[PDB]
Amino acid sequence: AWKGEVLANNEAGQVTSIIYNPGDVITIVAAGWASYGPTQKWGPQGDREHPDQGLICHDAFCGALVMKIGNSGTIPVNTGLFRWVAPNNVQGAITLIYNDVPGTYGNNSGSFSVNIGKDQS
Amino acid sequence: AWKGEVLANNEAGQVTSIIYNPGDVITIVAAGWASYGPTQKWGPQGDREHPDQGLICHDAFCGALVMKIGNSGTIPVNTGLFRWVAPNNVQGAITLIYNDVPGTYGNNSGSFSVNIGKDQS
Amino acid sequence: AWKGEVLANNEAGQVTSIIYNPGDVITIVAAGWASYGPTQKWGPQGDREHPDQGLICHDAFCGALVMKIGNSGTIPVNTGLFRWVAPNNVQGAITLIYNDVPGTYGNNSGSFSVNIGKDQS
Amino acid sequence: AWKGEVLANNEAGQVTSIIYNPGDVITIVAAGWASYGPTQKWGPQGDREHPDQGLICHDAFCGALVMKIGNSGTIPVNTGLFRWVAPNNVQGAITLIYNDVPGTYGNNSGSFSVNIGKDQS
Ligand SMILES: C=C(c1ccc(OC)cc1)c1ccc(S[C@@H]2O[C@H](CO)[C@H](O)[C@H](O)[C@H]2O)cc1
Ligand SMILES: C=C(c1ccc(OC)cc1)c1ccc(S[C@@H]2O[C@H](CO)[C@H](O)[C@H](O)[C@H]2O)cc1
Ligand SMILES: [Ca+2]
Ligand SMILES: [Ca+2]
Ligand SMILES: [Ca+2]
Ligand SMILES: [Ca+2]
C-alpha cells in the first residue's frame, strides 16, 4: 500500500509507488483541505460552485483529486475509489494530481492525505 | 460489502448490513453533497468554518459523516476509513449518520453515497 | 446632521441626534462590515443567503442596517435612504439597529459607519 | 439630481446627468446586488475576500461601485458618499462603473440602483 500527501500547488502531481497492472483492484481514500487560489479551502471533491476554466480533468470539479495511471488521461478520484478496476487498457505508476487549470498552480494552498492499496482479486 | 445512501435529514442514521466484529478490518469510502440547513452543500468532511453548536460528534465538523458501531458513541468517518480496526471494545451493526445538532435534522438536504467492506485480516 | 458608528453587537441600537419631525426629508449613507456570528462579514444589506430565524426586521436580511423612529416598528435602511420621508404619524429620535435575532447579539462583531442629514424641504 | 441603474456588465460605465463643478457638494446612495462572474452576488462594497487581479480601481474591492468625474481616475463610491467634495482640478460629468478587470465584464450580472444629488453649499 502507499500513504502520502499530494500538494495542491504540485502541477506535475505526486508519483506513488503503486503500479496499476491489468486486473488489479484498488481502493483509494483521500482526505484534507486545499484551495486553487481563494482563501477558502475545499475537500477532495473540490468546489461544486466554480466553473471549469480549462481544468486538467473535465469530469471533476476544480480542486478535486484526480489521477493518472502511466501515460493515461486524467481519471477522477475525489474522496476515493472503492475496489476499483480500470475500465480501459491503462497500466503504470499512479500519479495523484490536484485538479486545476494548467499554469495556475502557483497560488494553490494545502494538500490531501491519500491512502492507496491493492485489494484481493 | 454494503453500498447505500445516508440522507442528511435522517436523525436516527442509516443502518447497514455490516456487523463490525473483533479484529475486523474495514474500508469505507463516502462521497456526495449535503447540507445541515444552508442552501450551500458540503462533502463528507462537512463545513470547516461552522462552529460546533452541540453536534452528535465533537471530533468532526457539522455536516461530516460519522458512524456508530452497535451501542457505541459516534466515530468520525469523513471521506472514509482505510483498512481501519476499531481501537476499543466496539461491536455490532454499523449505522452511518450525518453530523448535526440533535433535533435540527428536519431542514437538512442531500445525502452521501457510502461503500463499506471488510478487508483481509 | 449626525455621524457615528452602529455596533453589530448593540441589541438596543445606536441612538442618533436626529429627531424626525413631520415633513422632514432625510438622507442616510451607511458603510462597513459586520457579522451576526459567522466568520464572514457582510455590508449594510446583510446576508441575502441566510433565512429569517426571528429577525427584528422581517423586511431586510439578517445583518442589514435598520432603524426605528420614536414609536415605530423597524424600517429597513440597508446602504441608506435618499431624500426620504417617513410614513404618516412616524416621528421622534432615530435609533439605528443591526438586524438580528433577539438574544443572539453577543456573538456579533464589526460595525457600520452611518451619516444622517436633513434635506431641504 | 440623478437616479438610475448601473449594470455590472457595462464596462464603459453609466453616464449620469450630474456635472461636478468646482465647490459642489454631492451625496450618492447606492444599493443592490451584482456579480463579477461567480454564482454569489455582492452589494456595492463588492467582495472583500477576492484579490485584485487587475481592477479598474485598486482602492475598492472587486464588484464595488466606483466613479469617474470628467478626466479623473477611478474614485471609490461603495455604498455612497455623504456631502462629499472632489479633489482639486476634478470636474465634469460623473460616470458610475462596476469595479472589475477590463475585458471580463461579459460574465457579470445584476446592477446597482444609484441616486446622486447636489447638496447646499
Ligand atoms: C448565526 C449563526 C452563527 C454562526 C456562527 C457562530 O459562531 C461562529 C454563531 C452563530 C448560524 C447561522 C446559520 C446556522 S445554520 C443551522 O446550523 C445548525 C447546526 O449548527 C442546525 O443544523 C440548523 O438546523 C441550521 O439551520 C447556524 C448558526
Ligand atoms: C471572476 C471569476 C469567475 C468566477 C466564475 C465565473 O463564471 C461562473 C466567471 C468568472 C473567478 C474568480 C476567482 C477565481 S480563482 C482562480 O481559479 C482558477 C481556476 O478556475 C485558477 O486556479 C487561479 O489560480 C485562481 O486564482 C477564478 C475565477
Ligand atoms: Ca490556482
Ligand atoms: Ca440542520
Ligand atoms: Ca447573532
Ligand atoms: Ca467579470
XYZ file of C-alpha atoms and ligand atoms in Angstrom:
544
model
C 0.000 0.000 0.000
C 1.041 3.662 -0.284
C 0.229 6.563 2.031
C 1.365 10.092 1.365
C 0.426 13.675 0.702
C -0.370 15.453 -2.568
C 0.202 19.234 -2.512
C -2.400 21.380 -4.261
C 0.429 23.503 -5.797
C 2.161 20.425 -7.318
C 1.367 20.780 -11.043
C 3.250 17.590 -12.081
C 1.489 15.607 -9.356
C 2.693 13.254 -6.665
C 4.057 9.941 -8.046
C 3.126 6.954 -5.832
C 4.815 3.554 -5.518
C 1.576 1.858 -6.763
C 1.974 0.349 -10.238
C -1.522 -0.346 -11.595
C -1.428 -3.645 -13.560
C -4.164 -5.380 -15.605
C -6.849 -6.945 -13.338
C -5.718 -5.064 -10.200
C -8.453 -3.935 -7.854
C -7.525 -0.814 -5.859
C -9.004 1.227 -3.084
C -8.152 4.926 -2.562
C -9.211 7.088 0.392
C -8.433 10.818 0.268
C -8.879 13.450 2.961
C -7.976 17.009 3.715
C -8.347 20.644 2.721
C -6.920 22.539 -0.261
C -7.513 25.600 -2.438
C -6.952 26.542 -6.085
C -6.288 30.151 -5.015
C -9.157 31.535 -2.833
C -8.547 31.856 0.947
C -11.364 29.277 1.458
C -10.472 25.536 1.243
C -12.404 22.533 -0.107
C -12.164 18.769 0.278
C -11.146 16.220 -2.342
C -14.391 16.711 -4.352
C -13.358 20.344 -4.939
C -15.642 23.365 -5.422
C -19.027 22.434 -6.873
C -19.864 26.115 -7.495
C -16.813 27.042 -9.640
C -16.900 26.745 -13.439
C -14.403 24.684 -15.429
C -11.988 27.286 -16.880
C -9.755 24.646 -18.549
C -9.099 22.064 -15.871
C -6.787 19.057 -16.367
C -9.901 16.898 -15.629
C -13.267 17.933 -17.031
C -15.109 15.135 -15.182
C -14.311 16.521 -11.652
C -14.658 19.968 -10.061
C -11.825 22.493 -9.705
C -9.964 21.493 -6.571
C -10.831 17.773 -6.776
C -8.288 14.966 -6.526
C -7.600 13.201 -9.846
C -5.012 10.674 -11.005
C -3.089 9.435 -13.991
C -2.067 5.795 -14.483
C 1.133 5.696 -16.561
C 0.582 7.649 -19.830
C -3.234 7.927 -19.233
C -5.507 10.938 -19.309
C -6.815 12.209 -16.000
C -9.224 9.976 -14.040
C -11.397 11.413 -11.224
C -10.616 10.184 -7.679
C -12.488 12.718 -5.492
C -12.854 11.209 -1.959
C -11.685 7.862 -3.243
C -12.383 4.720 -5.232
C -13.734 1.520 -3.644
C -12.444 -1.827 -5.033
C -11.983 -0.147 -8.449
C -10.782 -1.783 -11.681
C -9.617 0.394 -14.599
C -12.293 0.226 -17.387
C -9.730 0.578 -20.246
C -6.158 -0.641 -21.134
C -4.343 1.661 -18.595
C -1.164 0.490 -16.814
C 1.683 2.051 -14.871
C 2.504 4.139 -11.837
C -0.329 6.094 -10.259
C 0.325 9.849 -10.017
C -2.112 11.894 -7.864
C -2.791 15.441 -9.027
C -4.870 18.400 -7.773
C -7.460 19.433 -10.468
C -6.657 22.979 -11.571
C -6.020 24.923 -14.830
C -2.507 24.395 -16.205
C -0.088 27.167 -15.338
C -2.246 28.348 -12.353
C -0.859 26.022 -9.605
C 1.446 28.631 -8.030
C -1.314 30.245 -5.897
C -2.652 26.888 -4.626
C -2.682 26.026 -0.896
C -2.991 22.867 1.194
C -2.871 19.197 0.419
C -4.719 15.918 0.555
C -3.651 12.855 2.570
C -4.149 9.756 0.436
C -4.017 6.040 1.016
C -3.929 3.532 -1.913
C -3.956 -0.220 -1.633
C -4.440 -3.238 -3.856
C -7.432 -5.334 -2.867
C -7.882 -9.096 -3.179
C -8.517 -10.226 -6.797
C -19.793 -5.400 1.384
C -22.548 -2.773 1.686
C -23.324 0.150 -0.612
C -26.093 2.610 0.071
C -27.101 6.170 0.754
C -27.313 8.089 4.035
C -29.724 11.058 3.998
C -28.569 14.218 5.763
C -32.082 14.603 7.306
C -32.010 11.064 8.808
C -31.501 11.752 12.535
C -31.503 8.043 13.554
C -28.983 7.242 10.821
C -28.831 4.619 8.116
C -28.323 1.064 9.478
C -26.007 -1.025 7.248
C -25.737 -4.810 6.914
C -22.084 -4.635 8.155
C -21.656 -6.155 11.622
C -18.290 -4.987 12.980
C -16.694 -7.888 14.926
C -13.453 -8.005 16.966
C -10.348 -7.979 14.696
C -12.282 -6.916 11.566
C -10.502 -4.542 9.230
C -12.888 -2.313 7.250
C -12.653 0.210 4.488
C -15.265 2.968 3.985
C -15.454 5.384 1.043
C -18.017 8.203 1.186
C -18.973 10.711 -1.492
C -21.558 13.323 -2.228
C -23.082 16.639 -1.215
C -25.268 17.532 1.776
C -26.307 20.458 3.969
C -27.264 20.966 7.621
C -29.669 23.744 6.569
C -27.903 26.404 4.398
C -28.597 26.391 0.619
C -24.862 25.602 0.099
C -23.731 21.924 0.293
C -20.540 20.310 1.629
C -18.838 16.947 1.224
C -18.417 14.220 3.829
C -15.867 16.280 5.847
C -18.601 18.882 6.451
C -18.165 22.642 6.953
C -14.774 23.550 8.404
C -15.919 27.143 9.047
C -19.015 26.382 11.193
C -18.784 26.150 14.990
C -19.887 23.096 16.965
C -23.286 24.106 18.427
C -23.868 20.689 20.078
C -23.127 18.144 17.385
C -23.593 14.378 17.863
C -19.815 14.102 17.118
C -17.438 16.695 18.530
C -14.434 15.228 16.669
C -15.829 16.036 13.145
C -17.282 19.191 11.573
C -21.005 19.930 11.226
C -22.106 18.142 8.084
C -19.471 15.375 8.271
C -20.238 11.667 8.002
C -19.930 9.780 11.311
C -20.876 6.283 12.453
C -21.900 4.223 15.430
C -20.932 0.566 15.901
C -23.637 -1.155 17.973
C -24.148 0.790 21.254
C -21.002 2.969 20.664
C -20.571 6.717 20.759
C -20.094 8.493 17.459
C -16.888 7.802 15.491
C -15.749 10.159 12.685
C -15.803 8.722 9.133
C -15.479 11.867 6.962
C -14.403 10.772 3.422
C -13.710 7.287 4.686
C -11.511 4.923 6.659
C -8.725 2.860 5.056
C -8.136 -0.686 6.426
C -9.381 0.511 9.850
C -9.581 -1.527 13.071
C -11.685 -0.257 15.999
C -9.291 0.941 18.791
C -11.674 -0.071 21.647
C -14.131 -2.939 22.523
C -16.867 -1.864 19.995
C -19.015 -4.476 18.202
C -22.263 -4.566 16.263
C -24.034 -3.167 13.239
C -22.587 -0.036 11.676
C -25.057 2.868 11.453
C -23.998 5.879 9.315
C -25.211 9.273 10.498
C -24.924 12.885 9.262
C -23.212 15.075 11.966
C -25.702 17.717 13.087
C -27.233 19.051 16.355
C -29.990 16.806 17.722
C -33.482 17.972 16.867
C -32.226 20.101 13.892
C -32.244 17.407 11.129
C -35.558 18.493 9.564
C -34.001 21.296 7.444
C -31.147 19.090 6.157
C -30.689 18.382 2.423
C -28.822 15.828 0.317
C -27.063 12.600 1.072
C -23.806 10.714 0.921
C -23.175 7.544 -1.112
C -21.170 5.114 1.006
C -19.399 1.849 0.406
C -18.198 -0.372 3.322
C -16.271 -3.590 3.022
C -14.318 -5.957 5.230
C -10.678 -6.239 4.234
C -8.381 -9.254 4.526
C -7.255 -9.925 8.140
C -26.901 66.073 10.912
C -25.354 63.074 12.723
C -22.366 60.766 12.072
C -21.363 57.750 14.115
C -20.896 54.026 14.396
C -23.566 51.324 14.822
C -22.064 48.264 16.597
C -23.441 44.908 15.336
C -23.437 43.612 18.973
C -25.569 46.585 20.204
C -29.005 44.957 20.628
C -30.793 48.107 21.930
C -29.414 50.121 18.997
C -27.414 53.331 18.470
C -29.495 56.461 19.242
C -28.748 59.407 16.938
C -29.185 63.154 17.446
C -31.750 63.207 14.575
C -35.324 63.911 15.678
C -37.523 63.074 12.682
C -40.385 65.644 12.626
C -43.456 65.714 10.330
C -42.499 66.763 6.785
C -38.746 66.233 7.289
C -36.698 64.838 4.417
C -33.603 62.833 5.428
C -30.645 61.174 3.697
C -28.726 58.238 5.245
C -25.451 56.739 3.938
C -24.162 53.558 5.692
C -20.928 51.674 5.097
C -18.802 48.951 6.656
C -18.535 45.266 7.515
C -20.195 43.260 10.276
C -21.168 39.720 11.233
C -24.211 38.188 13.026
C -21.949 35.273 14.126
C -20.247 33.585 11.110
C -16.570 34.108 10.214
C -17.634 36.020 7.054
C -18.667 39.717 7.193
C -21.416 41.478 5.217
C -22.195 45.113 4.349
C -25.268 47.044 5.429
C -27.619 44.993 3.141
C -26.712 41.902 5.240
C -26.674 38.274 4.053
C -29.077 37.531 1.185
C -28.460 33.743 1.561
C -29.483 33.433 5.271
C -33.093 32.682 6.231
C -35.037 34.865 8.707
C -34.885 32.900 12.016
C -36.727 35.611 14.024
C -35.201 38.932 12.929
C -36.216 42.261 14.482
C -36.993 43.382 10.885
C -38.654 40.860 8.570
C -38.329 43.258 5.564
C -34.482 43.190 5.495
C -31.837 40.463 5.530
C -30.013 39.240 8.594
C -27.069 41.643 9.183
C -28.767 44.586 7.392
C -28.973 48.057 8.916
C -32.481 49.035 10.117
C -33.910 51.903 12.186
C -36.701 52.886 14.493
C -38.131 56.434 14.577
C -39.648 57.148 18.008
C -42.633 54.714 18.452
C -42.149 52.996 15.049
C -41.547 49.381 14.196
C -38.287 48.614 12.405
C -37.738 50.211 8.971
C -35.081 48.922 6.542
C -32.102 51.272 5.943
C -29.640 48.948 4.181
C -26.974 51.124 2.462
C -29.093 54.208 3.058
C -32.111 56.257 2.037
C -32.038 59.242 -0.375
C -34.242 62.316 0.377
C -36.646 60.014 2.255
C -39.918 60.950 4.034
C -41.426 58.795 6.821
C -44.882 57.172 6.880
C -47.846 59.027 8.485
C -47.630 59.523 12.289
C -43.942 58.347 12.408
C -41.820 60.864 14.361
C -39.143 61.077 17.043
C -35.492 60.187 17.631
C -33.891 57.861 15.084
C -32.207 54.752 16.525
C -30.058 52.607 14.163
C -30.015 48.802 14.785
C -28.195 45.770 13.324
C -30.911 43.366 12.058
C -30.522 40.112 14.027
C -32.425 37.638 16.231
C -33.093 38.893 19.760
C -30.795 37.374 22.392
C -28.112 36.396 19.799
C -26.273 39.776 19.580
C -23.465 38.561 21.855
C -21.615 36.753 19.034
C -21.869 39.685 16.599
C -18.902 41.834 15.530
C -17.966 44.823 13.402
C -19.971 47.911 12.826
C -21.362 50.297 10.249
C -20.331 53.938 9.819
C -23.511 55.986 9.243
C -24.225 59.623 8.301
C -27.749 61.137 8.533
C -28.704 64.604 7.440
C -31.880 66.577 6.952
C -32.504 67.693 3.374
C -34.154 70.891 2.090
C -37.992 70.877 2.275
C -30.161 65.242 -9.137
C -29.974 61.882 -10.966
C -31.377 58.374 -10.332
C -30.713 55.277 -12.392
C -29.227 51.832 -12.693
C -25.556 50.862 -13.130
C -25.299 47.472 -14.923
C -22.407 45.273 -13.678
C -21.759 44.173 -17.322
C -21.432 47.823 -18.534
C -17.646 48.166 -18.962
C -17.706 51.795 -20.245
C -19.912 52.815 -17.303
C -23.264 54.563 -16.762
C -23.059 58.320 -17.514
C -25.195 60.468 -15.196
C -26.720 63.920 -15.682
C -24.533 65.253 -12.808
C -21.813 67.678 -13.902
C -19.488 68.058 -10.908
C -18.327 71.724 -10.834
C -15.713 73.331 -8.532
C -17.064 73.730 -4.983
C -20.030 71.371 -5.496
C -21.083 69.115 -2.635
C -22.734 65.822 -3.661
C -24.438 62.882 -1.943
C -24.604 59.387 -3.509
C -26.663 56.427 -2.215
C -26.162 53.041 -3.987
C -27.991 49.773 -3.407
C -28.444 46.356 -4.984
C -26.805 43.050 -5.863
C -24.361 42.179 -8.632
C -21.728 39.627 -9.606
C -18.330 39.861 -11.403
C -18.802 36.207 -12.522
C -19.407 33.873 -9.518
C -22.839 32.453 -8.624
C -22.889 34.623 -5.452
C -23.875 38.334 -5.570
C -22.397 41.235 -3.581
C -23.569 44.759 -2.693
C -21.903 47.987 -3.758
C -18.833 47.401 -1.477
C -18.049 44.288 -3.594
C -16.239 41.137 -2.426
C -13.787 41.701 0.442
C -12.397 38.126 0.044
C -11.363 38.397 -3.666
C -7.873 39.588 -4.625
C -7.309 42.468 -7.086
C -6.448 40.716 -10.406
C -6.239 43.997 -12.397
C -9.238 46.079 -11.286
C -10.055 49.471 -12.820
C -9.949 50.812 -9.216
C -7.234 49.469 -6.912
C -8.728 51.354 -3.894
C -12.008 49.343 -3.830
C -12.904 45.651 -3.884
C -13.859 43.688 -6.957
C -17.615 44.267 -7.537
C -17.643 47.655 -5.728
C -19.230 50.759 -7.233
C -16.705 53.389 -8.425
C -16.932 56.595 -10.476
C -15.029 58.871 -12.773
C -15.598 62.655 -12.837
C -14.658 64.058 -16.262
C -10.851 63.478 -16.714
C -10.392 61.734 -13.321
C -9.074 58.309 -12.488
C -11.491 55.984 -10.706
C -12.770 57.064 -7.265
C -14.403 54.592 -4.847
C -18.161 55.101 -4.239
C -19.100 51.841 -2.493
C -22.499 52.353 -0.767
C -22.239 56.089 -1.343
C -20.677 59.381 -0.307
C -22.251 61.903 2.122
C -21.913 65.674 1.388
C -18.676 64.920 -0.498
C -16.335 67.397 -2.267
C -13.945 66.320 -5.063
C -10.144 66.676 -5.126
C -8.534 69.787 -6.717
C -8.977 70.125 -10.519
C -11.558 67.241 -10.649
C -14.666 68.343 -12.592
C -17.086 67.182 -15.277
C -19.780 64.566 -15.875
C -19.976 61.736 -13.342
C -19.852 58.209 -14.802
C -20.611 55.258 -12.455
C -18.718 51.961 -13.097
C -18.746 48.418 -11.655
C -15.184 47.717 -10.398
C -13.871 44.727 -12.385
C -10.978 43.572 -14.599
C -11.045 45.012 -18.120
C -12.258 42.551 -20.764
C -14.069 40.333 -18.180
C -17.369 42.310 -17.945
C -19.175 39.851 -20.231
C -19.847 37.339 -17.423
C -21.114 39.981 -14.972
C -24.758 40.322 -13.896
C -27.079 42.411 -11.753
C -26.917 46.086 -11.158
C -26.927 48.834 -8.566
C -29.662 51.446 -8.118
C -27.961 54.821 -7.526
C -29.189 58.312 -6.564
C -26.922 61.406 -6.783
C -27.857 64.872 -5.670
C -26.120 68.182 -5.167
C -26.144 69.441 -1.582
C -26.343 73.027 -0.279
C -23.030 74.964 -0.458
C -25.879 32.779 13.367
C -25.214 31.655 13.131
C -23.883 31.542 13.794
C -22.807 31.062 13.062
C -21.572 31.033 13.668
C -21.421 31.433 15.011
O -20.185 31.424 15.641
C -19.057 31.383 14.763
C -22.541 31.895 15.710
C -23.791 31.954 15.113
C -25.732 30.484 12.435
C -26.124 30.600 11.146
C -26.607 29.552 10.446
C -26.711 28.316 11.033
S -27.377 27.021 10.127
C -28.014 25.871 11.292
O -26.948 25.087 11.801
C -27.364 24.257 12.896
C -26.139 23.492 13.456
O -25.113 24.348 13.908
C -28.552 23.321 12.575
O -28.123 22.310 11.657
C -29.717 24.114 11.962
O -30.649 23.209 11.523
C -29.174 25.033 10.884
O -30.267 25.861 10.397
C -26.327 28.189 12.364
C -25.807 29.255 13.068
C -14.148 36.049 -11.771
C -14.151 34.741 -11.541
C -15.241 33.972 -12.207
C -15.924 33.009 -11.479
C -16.974 32.360 -12.087
C -17.309 32.635 -13.428
O -18.371 32.003 -14.060
C -19.321 31.391 -13.183
C -16.580 33.606 -14.123
C -15.532 34.288 -13.524
C -13.109 33.991 -10.851
C -12.829 34.283 -9.561
C -11.880 33.622 -8.866
C -11.164 32.613 -9.459
S -9.931 31.830 -8.559
C -8.800 31.169 -9.729
O -9.322 29.955 -10.244
C -8.543 29.457 -11.342
C -9.212 28.179 -11.908
O -10.531 28.398 -12.357
C -7.045 29.252 -11.025
O -6.900 28.158 -10.113
C -6.442 30.523 -10.406
O -5.179 30.213 -9.971
C -7.375 31.033 -9.324
O -6.852 32.298 -8.831
C -11.432 32.316 -10.792
C -12.422 32.974 -11.491
Ca -4.752 28.084 -8.906
Ca -29.938 21.164 10.447
Ca -26.051 36.875 16.251
Ca -16.084 39.680 -14.632
